[PDB]
Design a binder for this molecule. Structure first.
Ligand SMILES: NC(=O)c1ncn([C@@H]2O[C@H](COP(=O)(O)O)[C@@H](O)[C@H]2O)c1N
Lengths: 315, 109, 85
């Protein structure tokens, strides 16, 4: 009947919707898929991400024709932070340029960063199965892998990313419009104890905020407490793609200066606002997170894409 | 930048011989021109899929190769997939993995 | 019908005035990966190009290989970045 019950029911629909669709129904009708061979040197892979505009690539072990994990920006975030907390040697870090992807993933297995279980869903199974994994883990993307019958080879179909299923359900559901319950009435996102940074903050000190908290991004605030910018974990690519691992010693300000114009943005909302609106956001703009602010752009909280996928997936 | 098959320039049957010698090196078997007492530039290669051999399976992969003139002196070695097949009873792999093999062979003659 | 021995006639040199190969047809002129037309979305692939190798230079010391291929009713063009050894 009312706002809190029109939303409760629309919620009930959009979940039912996603049990009814496959991961497959989400992929464009015709699309590309970049794959990196696990024997690729790191430098090469990083040049290849920059040049192709991509933040990620699925890995192929051509040897057994298997999927050798996923190269996200989290890999580089996890190695440097480890090197920083473990090494007495500040320049030891530059050594991850010799490494092949395989050998970086070997360091990552040892540290406990990479789970032994390599995470995957079959493309023709429910879209739900993609949501629950990425959610049970705090992954923000998941491979769709099928297996070729006549060969036993693993056909790697696509990668499915929180935003693309959130953009998907935004577009293919009328009920997103019936979600008019304001954020301040919901148990959603983080509101106390946000990890933050100022421009004067060192980059290596952001990036481990990233690892430890397990967060995709850290907002940058001033002394008056007002939001300015965000140092994303994908921003780490733009810092080391030249293999100057001492750019990790810059200030965030210094670092953000080197950020190029191909930048999706820093998105805001009032705590008064509601889900119906943020779906309209993610439908057109490439949104990755909303920052709750106020009258004067003082940071009040963080509503993240997982925050919202998980709010809608769970009964 | 992206273009079909592998570019090659030179002499008509000198590349065809290049392409034959490269096929031998990978292991792939191949068909041979039957002189009529032009299709000699259409080769049907049968490759052994190594991630099956070493397992025990006798599953093969079938790759037709075609050569075209592009302009005087310049040629394309087109490479198509005709799927894969076991002895007992889709995807771009092993196909792309084997084009990888062949191309390495062509380039290191 | 498959042979493992390299064909003889080639060896010995400019033997008979050998038959010319066919010229490149307009269909293999344009590779859909030359397109910024979501930056993973591609133009619908040709019916006939499916399962044909595409290559590009990297300036990086790696081979770039692709094929487009069907998957149920949607199309998957897959680009491969891979070493030589
Ligand atoms: N700056 C922060 O503290 C912060 N950034 C994100 N988060 C929360 O951590 C979780 C992971 O966020 P993401 O999946 O966007 O990296 C979400 O629940 C989100 O509300 C935070 N607490």
């Amino acid at each position: 009947m009312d706002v809190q019950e029109t939303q409760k029911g629309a919620l009930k629909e959009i979940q039912a919707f996603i049990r009814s669709r496959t991961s497959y129904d989400v992929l464009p009708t015709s699309f590309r898929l970049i794959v990196f061979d696990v024997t690729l040197f790191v430098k090469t892979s990083l040049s290849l991400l920059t040049l192709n505009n991509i933040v990620s690539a699925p890995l192929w072990d051509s040897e057994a024709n298997k999927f050798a994990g996923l190269l996200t920006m989290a890999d580089f975030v996890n190695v440097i932070k480890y090197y920083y907390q473990s090494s007495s040697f500040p320049e030891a870090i530059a050594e991850i340029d010799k490494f092949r992807l395989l050998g970086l993933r070997e360091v990552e297995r040892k540290i406990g960063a990479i789970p032994p279980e390599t995470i995957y869903v079959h493309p023709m199974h429910s879209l739900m199965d993609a949501c629950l994994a990425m959610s049970k883990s705090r992954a923000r993307r998941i491979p769709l892998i099928d297996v070729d019958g006549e060969t036993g080879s693993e056909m790697i179909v696509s990668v499915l990313t929180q935003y693309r299923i959130l953009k998907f359900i935004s577009m293919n559901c009328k009920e997103t419009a019936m979600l008019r319950v304001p954020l301040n009435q919901m148990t959603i996102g983080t509101w106390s104890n946000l990890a933050t940074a100022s421009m004067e903050t060192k980059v290596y000190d952001v990036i481990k905020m990233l690892a430890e908290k397990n967060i995709s991004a850290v907002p940058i605030v001033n002394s008056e407490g007002t939001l300015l910018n965000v140092y994303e974990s994908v921003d780490v690519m733009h810092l080391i793609q030249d293999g100057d691992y001492s750019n990790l010693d810059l200030s965030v300000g210094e670092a953000l200066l080197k950020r190029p114009a191909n930048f999706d943005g820093v998105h805001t909302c009032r705590a008064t606002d509601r889900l119906d609106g943020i779906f309209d956001a993610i439908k057109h703009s490439r949104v990755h997170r909303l920052f709750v602010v106020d009258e004067n752009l003082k940071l009040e909280g963080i509503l993240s894409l997982a925050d919202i996928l998980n709010y809608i997936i769970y009964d | 930048k992206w273009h079909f098959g592998v570019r090659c320039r030179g002499d008509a049957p000198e590349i065809l011989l290049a392409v034959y010698r490269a096929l031998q090196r990978a292991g792939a078997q191949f068909t041979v021109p039957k002189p009529v007492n032009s299709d000699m530039y259409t080769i049907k290669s049968r490759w052994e899929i190594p991630h099956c051999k070493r397992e025990g399976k006798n599953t093969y992969a079938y790759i037709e190769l075609q050569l075209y003139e592009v302009m005087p002196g310049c040629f394309m070695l087109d490479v198509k997939s005709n799927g894969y097949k076991d002895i007992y009873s889709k995807s771009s792999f092993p196909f792309l993995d084997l084009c990888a093999m062949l191309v390495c062979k062509l380039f290191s003659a | 019908q498959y042979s493992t021995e390299i064909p003889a006639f080639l060896t010995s040199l400019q033997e008979l005035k050998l038959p010319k190969p066919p010229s490149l047809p307009p269909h293999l002129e344009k590779c859909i990966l030359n397109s910024n037309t979501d930056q993973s979305v591609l133009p619908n692939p040709n019916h006939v190009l499916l399962n044909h190798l595409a290559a590009a230079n990297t300036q990086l010391g790696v081979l770039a290989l692709s094929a487009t291929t069907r998957y149920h009713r949607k199309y998957v063009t897959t680009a491969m970045f891979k070493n030589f050894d």
